[PDB]
Ligand binder design. Structure first.
Ligand SMILES: *[C@@H]1O[C@H](CO)[C@@H](O[C@@H]2O[C@H](CO)[C@@H](O[C@@H]3O[C@H](CO[C@H]4O[C@H](CO)[C@@H](O)[C@H](O)[C@@H]4O)[C@@H](O)[C@H](O[C@H]4O[C@H](CO)[C@@H](O)[C@H](O)[C@@H]4O)[C@@H]3O)[C@H](O)[C@H]2NC(C)=O)[C@H](O)[C@H]1NC(C)=O
Ligand SMILES: *[C@@H]1O[C@H](CO[C@@H]2O[C@@H](C)[C@@H](O)[C@@H](O)[C@@H]2O)[C@@H](O[C@@H]2O[C@H](CO)[C@@H](O)[C@H](O)[C@H]2NC(C)=O)[C@H](O)[C@H]1NC(C)=O
Ligand SMILES: *[C@@H]1O[C@H](CO)[C@@H](O[C@@H]2O[C@H](CO)[C@@H](O)[C@H](O)[C@H]2NC(C)=O)[C@H](O)[C@H]1NC(C)=O
Ligand SMILES: *[C@@H]1O[C@H](CO)[C@@H](O[C@@H]2O[C@H](CO)[C@@H](O)[C@H](O)[C@H]2NC(C)=O)[C@H](O)[C@H]1NC(C)=O
Ligand SMILES: *[C@@H]1O[C@H](CO)[C@@H](O)[C@H](O)[C@H]1NC(C)=O
Ligand SMILES: *[C@@H]1O[C@H](CO)[C@@H](O)[C@H](O)[C@H]1NC(C)=O
Ligand SMILES: *[C@@H]1O[C@H](CO)[C@@H](O)[C@H](O)[C@H]1NC(C)=O
Ligand SMILES: *[C@@H]1O[C@H](CO)[C@@H](O)[C@H](O)[C@H]1NC(C)=O
Ligand SMILES: *[C@@H]1O[C@H](CO)[C@@H](O)[C@H](O)[C@H]1NC(C)=O
Lengths: 187, 680
C-alpha cells in the first residue's frame, strides 16, 4: 500500500503511539520484511505465512519504539504498567513484530521516549485503564507530559476532576539499529 | 455602644477565621493524603499562621467585656475567644508544664515491656496489646499487665505529681476552683428559664446515672465472672472482683474481648454479610453511596460533588503513604470530605455510616458563626453518630436493603448474643469512665493526699468497677497515668455522656417514627418525621445551651440512663435468670490475700530485714528437698500496711511471678527457720 510513513524519521512513543488504516491497496508484506529485519514474529490465531497471502478488506497497523528486553511487558495476560495505562492490544481480530531498523533508513531516536506508569482519579483512586485498540486519555497524557522523568506521582486538575499521574522514560535504551514494535491486525 | 463594637469585632474575626481555617485544614488534609517532608512543612507553616491570628485576636477580645453584652451569640463567641488558658502562667511555669506534658506523652508512647524469664523477646505497646487481647495464658497476661505498670507507670509518677499542681494553678488563673472545674466547665451554660446548667452538677448527674445502670452492670459482672472462671480456673472466686489482667486489655476499659469466653449461645452463628457483599460485587463507592441513600431516606442532607471527587474512600496503591485511621473532615468553605481505607467488610460498611453521619452534623451547623460551629457539647458529636450507626447495624435494615436472605429471621438466641456484645462494649465501659474521672476530679480538687493516690485508686476501683490488682502496689506507682488519656491531658467523661445521650436520642427518634416493639429493633429509614426532628437540633450548634438541644429531641433538660436500660431490657432479664443470687460482688477479696500471713508490730530498714528473713526461711524449707529456689527479700510482697501497727505479706517464685506459695508452706518455712533470725 503506502508504507512510506511506517518507516519515517518520527518514531512514536508508547504514551502517544501512532496507527494507520490501509484500504483500497494491493498489500506488499514481502517488501516490508525485506526493508527491515525481524527478530520475532509473535501472533495468535494467524501465521506469518497467512498474512502474506490473499487480500483483506482492511489492514490496520499500530506502532511505537520499544526496547527488546521489555518484550514480556506487551504479552497477553500481562498486568504491567506499560500495557495497562497505555497500549492494550486488540485480540478480537488476528501480530506483534519485533523489528530492528538499520540507521541507513532515516529513522531517528530523539526525545524522552516514555510511557505512563500510573493515572488514578476521583475519591476512589479508580484507575484509568486503556481499552484494547484505544489510547491513553488526554487527561492522563496531559498530566504525564508535565511530570518528572523520575516517576514522581503528581496531582493535576482536569475539568474539575483530580488525577494523580506519573511518567517513566526509556530514552536510554537505544541502539543505532533501534528496536521498534509494530502490531498488525487483519480484517 | 459595647454591643455594637463587639458585633463588628466578631464579624471581622469570623471572616478571616474561616479563610485561615481553610488554609490550615487543607494543608493538614493534603499532608495526610500524601505523606512527605514538603507537605509536613506546609502544614506546620499554615498552623503557625493560624495560631498567630487566633492569639492576636484573643488580645483584642479583652476590649469587649461580657458585662455589657445582651446578645447571646456575641456573649458566647467572646467567651470562647477571650479565654487565657496556659497564658496566665509565668514563663517558667508555662515552659515547665509544656516540658512535663511532652515527657509524659513520650514515656507512655515508646514504653516497652520485656519478658522477665526470656529477655530477648520484648514488645512495644502495640505488641503488648496484641498479646493482651489474644493470649489465654494467665502467666503471660500478668507479666504484660504488671510490666507496663512498672516500666511506664512508675516513670510517669514523678511527673504527674508536679503536673497536677501546675494544671490547678492554670485553672485558678482562669477563675476556676481547680483543674476539675476547668474541664467540667465545658458543660456550663447560662440561658433563660430552666436552660441554665452548672458545671458543678456534672458530678451530680454522673453519680445519679451511674447508680441507675448499676443493676445492669452487676448482672453483667456476675455472668462474665461465672463464665470467665472456666477460662482461668481457681484464679477467680465465685463471688468477688475480676483480676485486672484477665479483662481482655491493658487497662480493662472494655470487656469487648471477653465475649468469646462468655457467649450465651456459642454454637449459633452471629449476623454479618461480608460473604454476601463479596458475592454481590460491592466496593468502596457502593458502600458510601448506599450510606448516602440512607441519610436521604431519613430526610437529612445529600453529599456534595467535592466529596466524591476530593475524598479518600479507598486505600491507594499508587506508591503514596497514608494513614488509614477513619476521620471525617471539615475543611471550611462547606468542603466536606472523608478519609478512610474502605474494603468489603461489615466493619467498614458500618464505619462508613459513622463518618458520613459526622458530616451530616457538620453541615447542619455550618450556618453558625465560626466559633459556634461545633455540636452542643463534647458528647453530642459522637452520640449522634452512634445512633445513626445502630440504625443500620440492625438486620431489619440489612434485610429491607436486600443484603440478607428474605427468609432471614431473628432468633431469640441471636438477640441475646447481640445484646451481650453491646453490653460488654457499653455497660462494661461506663463504670470505667465514671470511676476514672471520679478519682481524677478528687485528685485535682485536693480531696486525696498525694501519699494516698494509689491507695484510693485501687480501693475505689474495687468498689465501683469490681476490678482488683493481681499484685499490691506502692505509692511509687501511678496506674492512672498508664492510660493515654491521663498521660496526654484529655477529658475522659465524654465517653460516659455520649453513651447516655445516644440512647436518649435514639429512643425519642423511634417514638417520633412511630416504632413499636423493643428499641434494639428500631429503624429510622423511611421516617422523614424522625429525620426532621434530628435536623432541627443538629443545626443549633453551640448557639444554644446543650440542655436546649437535648430538650428539643428528647423532651428533657437532664441526662437519664432511662433509655439505656430499655435498650438492654431483654439482656437484663436473661442475665438475671443466669445469675440468680450471684448478683454483684464483694470488695474484700483479692487474688493474693488468701495465702497471706499477718505481721504484728517500724523502719523501712526493718521491713527489709523482715523480708530478707522470710526469703531465707523459704530457701531453707526448699533446701531440705532437692529443689533450689533463689528467694530474696525482693520476692516477698507486702500488702496494704498500717504504719507501726501491722502489715500482711506473701511470697512468690522469682522465676514465675504468677505463683503464690500457700500460707501453710510459708508459715512453717518460717517456723523451721525460727532460729538464727537474730543480729548484732
Ligand atoms: C505530593 O506532594 C508533593 C509535594 O508538595 C507534590 O509535589 C509538587 O507537585 C506540584 C504539582 O502538583 C509541582 O508544581 C509544578 O512545578 C513545576 C516546576 O517544577 C520545577 O521547579 C520546582 C520549584 O518551583 C521544583 O521543586 C521542581 O523539582 C522542578 O525543578 C511547574 O512547571 C508546574 O507548572 C504547572 O502548573 C502551573 C500552575 O500555575 C501552570 O501555570 C503551568 O503551565 C503548569 O501547568 C507546577 O507548578 C511542585 O513543584 C511539586 N513540589 C516539589 C517539591 O517538587 C506531589 O505532586 C504530590 N503528589 C500527589 C499525588 O498529590
Ligand atoms: C466531579 O466533579 C465534576 C464537576 O465539578 C463541578 O464543576 C467544576 C467545574 C467545579 O466548579 C467543581 O468545584 C464542581 O463541583 C462532576 O461533573 C458534573 O456531573 C453532573 C452530573 O451529576 C453534570 O450534570 C455536570 O454537567 C458535570 N459538570 C462538569 C463540569 O462536567 C462529577 O460528576 C463529579 N464526580 C462525581 C463522582 O460526582
Ligand atoms: C486574661 O488575662 C488578663 C491579664 O493579662 C485579664 O485582664 C486583667 O483583668 C483584671 C480584672 O478585671 C484587671 O484589673 C486588669 O487590669 C486586666 N489587665 C489587662 C492587661 O487588661 C483578663 O481579664 C483575662 N481574661 C479572661 C477571660 O480571663
Ligand atoms: C474470637 O473468635 C474468633 C473466631 O470465631 C476469632 O477470629 C479469628 O481471628 C484470627 C486472627 O487472630 C483469624 O486468622 C481467623 O480467620 C478468625 N476466624 C474466623 C472464623 O474469622 C477472633 O480473633 C477472636 N477474638 C479474640 C479477642 O480472641
Ligand atoms: C543492517 O546493516 C548491516 C551491516 O552493519 C547489514 O549486514 C544488515 O543486513 C542490514 N540490515 C538490513 C535490514 O538491511
Ligand atoms: C443576636 O445577634 C445575631 C447576629 O450575630 C442576630 O442575628 C440576632 O437576631 C441577635 N439577637 C438578639 C436578641 O439581639
Ligand atoms: C425504604 O423504602 C424504599 C422504597 O422507596 C425501599 O426500597 C427500601 O428498602 C426501604 N428501606 C428499608 C430499610 O426498608
Ligand atoms: C426462645 O423461645 C423458645 C420458645 O419458642 C424458648 O423455649 C427459649 O427458652 C427462648 N430462648 C431465649 C434465649 O429467650
Ligand atoms: C508457674 O506455675 C504454674 C503452676 O501454677 C505453671 O503451670 C507455669 O508453667 C509456671 N510458669 C513459669 C514461668 O514457671
Amino acid at each position: 500500500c503506502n508504507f512510506t510513513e511506517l518507516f519515517r524519521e518520527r518514531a512514536p512513543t508508547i504514551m502517544q503511539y501512532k496507527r494507520e488504516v490501509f484500504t483500497r491497496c494491493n498489500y506488499n508484506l514481502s517488501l516490508l520484511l525485506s526493508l527491515v529485519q525481524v527478530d520475532e514474529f509473535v501472533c495468535d490465531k494467524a501465521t506469518p505465512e497467512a498474512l502474506a497471502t490473499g487480500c483483506y478488506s482492511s489492514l490496520t497497523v499500530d506502532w511505537f519504539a520499544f526496547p527488546y528486553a521489555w518484550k514480556s511487558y506487551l504479552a497477553i495476560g500481562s498486568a504491567d504498567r506499560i500495557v495497562r495505562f497505555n497500549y492494550n492490544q486488540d485480540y478480537s481480530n488476528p501480530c506483534r513484530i519485533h523489528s530492528k531498523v538499520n540507521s541507513s533508513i532515516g529513522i531517528s531516536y530523539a526525545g524522552a521516549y516514555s510511557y505512563i506508569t500510573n493515572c488514578n482519579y476521583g475519591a476512589t483512586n479508580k484507575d484509568d485503564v486503556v481499552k484494547p485498540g484505544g489510547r491513553a486519555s488526554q487527561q492522563c497524557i496531559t498530566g504525564a507530559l508535565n511530570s518528572p522523568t523520575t516517576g514522581q506521582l503528581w496531582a493535576y486538575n482536569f475539568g474539575g476532576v483530580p488525577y494523580r499521574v506519573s511518567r517513566l522514560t526509556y530514552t536510554d535504551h537505544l541502539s543505532d539499529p533501534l528496536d521498534m514494535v509494530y502490531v498488525i491486525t487483519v480484517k | 455602644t459595647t454591643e455594637e463594637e463587639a458585633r463588628d469585632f466578631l464579624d471581622k474575626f469570623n471572616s478571616e477565621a474561616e479563610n485561615l481555617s481553610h488554609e490550615s485544614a487543607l494543608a493538614s488534609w493534603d499532608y495526610n493524603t500524601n505523606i512527605t517532608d514538603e507537605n509536613a512543612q506546609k502544614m506546620n507553616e499554615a498552623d503557625s499562621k493560624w495560631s498567630d491570628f487566633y492569639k492576636e485576636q484573643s488580645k483584642r477580645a479583652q476590649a469587649f467585656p461580657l458585662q455589657e453584652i445582651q446578645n447571646l451569640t456575641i456573649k458566647l463567641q467572646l467567651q470562647i475567644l477571650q479565654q487565657n488558658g496556659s497564658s496566665v502562667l509565668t514563663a517558667e511555669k508555662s515552659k515547665r508544664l509544656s516540658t512535663i506534658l511532652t515527657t509524659m506523652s513520650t514515656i507512655y508512647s515508646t514504653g516497652k515491656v520485656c519478658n522477665p524469664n526470656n529477655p530477648q523477646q520484648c514488645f512495644t505497646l502495640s505488641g503488648l496489646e496484641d498479646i493482651m487481647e489474644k493470649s489465654k495464658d494467665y502467666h503471660q497476661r500478668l507479666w504484660v499487665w504488671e510490666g507496663w505498670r512498672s516500666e511506664v507507670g512508675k516513670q510517669l509518677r514523678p511527673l504527674y505529681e508536679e503536673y497536677v499542681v501546675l494544671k490547678n494553678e492554670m485553672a485558678r488563673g482562669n477563675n476556676y476552683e481547680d483543674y476539675g472545674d476547668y474541664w467540667r466547665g465545658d458543660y456550663e451554660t447560662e440561658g433563660e428559664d430552666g436552660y441554665n446548667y452548672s458545671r458543678n452538677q456534672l458530678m451530680e448527674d454522673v453519680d445519679r446515672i451511674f447508680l441507675e445502670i448499676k443493676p445492669l452492670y452487676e448482672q453483667l459482672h456476675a455472668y462474665v465472672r461465672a463464665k470467665l472462671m472456666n477460662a482461668y480456673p481457681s484464679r477467680i472466686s465465685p463471688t468477688g472482683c475480676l483480676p485486672a489482667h484477665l479483662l481482655g486489655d491493658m487497662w480493662g476499659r472494655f470487656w469487648t474481648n471477653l465475649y468469646n469466653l462468655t457467649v450465651p449461645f456459642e454454637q449459633k452463628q452471629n449476623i454479618d454479610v461480608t460473604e454476601t457483599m463479596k458475592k454481590q460485587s460491592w466496593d468502596a463507592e457502593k458502600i458510601f453511596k448506599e450510606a448516602e441513600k440512607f441519610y436521604l431516606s431519613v430526610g437529612l442532607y445529600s453529599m456534595t460533588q467535592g466529596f466524591w471527587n476530593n475524598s479518600m474512600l479507598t486505600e491507594p496503591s499508587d506508591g503514596r503513604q497514608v494513614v488509614c485511621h477513619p476521620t471525617a473532615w471539615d475543611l471550611g468553605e462547606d468542603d466536606f470530605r472523608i478519609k478512610m481505607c474502605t474494603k468489603v467488610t461489615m466493619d467498614d460498611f458500618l464505619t462508613a455510616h459513622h463518618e458520613m453521619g459526622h458530616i451530616q452534623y457538620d453541615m447542619a451547623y455550618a450556618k453558625q458563626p465560626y466559633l459556634l460551629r461545633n455540636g452542643a457539647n463534647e458528647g453530642f458529636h459522637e452520640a449522634v453518630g452512634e445512633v445513626m450507626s445502630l440504625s443500620v447495624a440492625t438486620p431489619k435494615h440489612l434485610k429491607g436493603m436486600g443484603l440478607l436472605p428474605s427468609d432471614f429471621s431473628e432468633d431469640n438466641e441471636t438477640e441475646i448474643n447481640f445484646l451481650l456484645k453491646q453490653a460488654l462494649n457499653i455497660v462494661g465501659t461506663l463504670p470505667f469512665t465514671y470511676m476514672l474521672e471520679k478519682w481524677r476530679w478528687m485528685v485535682f480538687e485536693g480531696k486525696i493526699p498525694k501519699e494516698q493516690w494509689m491507695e484510693k485508686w485501687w480501693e475505689m476501683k474495687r468498689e465501683i468497677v469490681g476490678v482488683v490488682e493481681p499484685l499490691p502496689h506502692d505509692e511509687t506507682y501511678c496506674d492512672p497515668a498508664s492510660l493515654f488519656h491521663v498521660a496526654n491531658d484529655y477529658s475522659f467523661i465524654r465517653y460516659f455522656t455520649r453513651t447516655i445521650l445516644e440512647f436518649q436520642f435514639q429512643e425519642a427518634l423511634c417514638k417520633i417514627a412511630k416504632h413499636e416493639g423493643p428499641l434494639h429493633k428500631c429503624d429510622i429509614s423511611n421516617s422523614t418525621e424522625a429525620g426532621k426532628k434530628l435536623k432541627d437540633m443538629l443545626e443549633l450548634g453551640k448557639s444554644k445551651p446543650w440542655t436546649y438541644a437535648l430538650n428539643q429531641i428528647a423532651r428533657t433538660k437532664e441526662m437519664d440512663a432511662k433509655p439505656l436500660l430499655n435498650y438492654f431490657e431483654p439482656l437484663f432479664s436473661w442475665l438475671k435468670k443466669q445469675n440468680g443470687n450471684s448478683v454483684g460482688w464483694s470488695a474484700d477479696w483479692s487474688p493474693y490475700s488468701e495465702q497471706s500471713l499477718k505481721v504484728r508490730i517500724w523502719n523501712d530498714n526493718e521491713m527489709y530485714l523482715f523480708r530478707s528473713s522470710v526469703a531465707y526461711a523459704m530457701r531453707v524449707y526448699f533446701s531440705k528437698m532437692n529443689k533450689t529456689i533463689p528467694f530474696t527479700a525482693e520476692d516477698v510482697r507486702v500488702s496494704d500496711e498500717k504504719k507501726r501497727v501491722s502489715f500482711k505479706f506473701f511470697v512468690t517464685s522469682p522465676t514465675n511471678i504468677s505463683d503464690i506459695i500457700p500460707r501453710s508452706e510459708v508459715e512453717d518455712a518460717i517456723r523451721m527457720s525460727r532460729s538464727r533470725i537474730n543480729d548484732a
